[PDB]
Design a protein around this ligand. Sequence first.
Ligand code: CA
Lengths: 11, 321
Amino acid sequence: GFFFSARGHRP
Amino acid sequence: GSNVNHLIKVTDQSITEGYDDSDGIIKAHDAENLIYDVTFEVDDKVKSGDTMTVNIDKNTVPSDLTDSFAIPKIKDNSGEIIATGTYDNTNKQITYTFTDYVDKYENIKAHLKLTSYIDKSKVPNNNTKLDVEYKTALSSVNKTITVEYQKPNENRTANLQSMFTNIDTKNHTVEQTIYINPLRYSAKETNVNISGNGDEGSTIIDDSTIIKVYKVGDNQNLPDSNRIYDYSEYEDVTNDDYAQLGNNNDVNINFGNIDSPYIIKVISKYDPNKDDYTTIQQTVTMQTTINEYTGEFRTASYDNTIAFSTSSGQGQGDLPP
Ligand SMILES: [Ca+2]
């Protein structure tokens, strides 16, 4: 019952 | 059992942005979701087997990284199932089918809180203004928002960006789409390192890791969405001889001197024992040489972390006296 996506990060 | 949309009275609807610090803008690359809340009344005439529909905006999807997911059952406060739903990807429509519950209780009402994300295949470009529309039965609600995508991280000639574009929870793998040199700089002695050793999570990089590299032509433009839906459109230049595992849960890909953008699609596994999906993180670092005599170099990094949201359906009916 999980809906997925994703994050981006800039070091 | 037949359609009873006309017997469903929607009393309240709203479209809410997942975050509170970017009103009017959906930061798709920060995993910001669109939440559709709706409350409705079910006429007593509705019987078991009858159906009703719910629609999400055609520029959105329930899940960004997966195509398989369960639509929340609508249950009352005793746990009884009022209705079960199914999702149709062709028309972004959910169909709920009422159970024997509607033939036992009356004055039934329900509330749905459904999450959703921007459908990257429909919105390839940054700053795309949309008038998103969600519907329940024969009612609808609209909201204007602008979709914003990320920008590359750069340091001299080193420049890149990346995004997770799939997750297989059954086989425990994630897919990361990496844009190398999207800015078309003259990157000398370019090396790309992909690491599963993150500061907030991890993945597993080993000889099972699948890496494919594609060259972007002079006439092509990568979509801002950072997701490729048709790789046959790009020149496959994969050469395993240039990918070599490193000594720290990583792998190094030698690109040499380049002036064009490249796409790297990587499929890696993640620890099945993880209990927190947000601990799945993969890091990419592009290194370029800025001084051919001294070998002095620069690096630009990027990392992605898996994100997720949930949906729910609640209801309640009265047992007739
Ligand atoms: Ca926002």
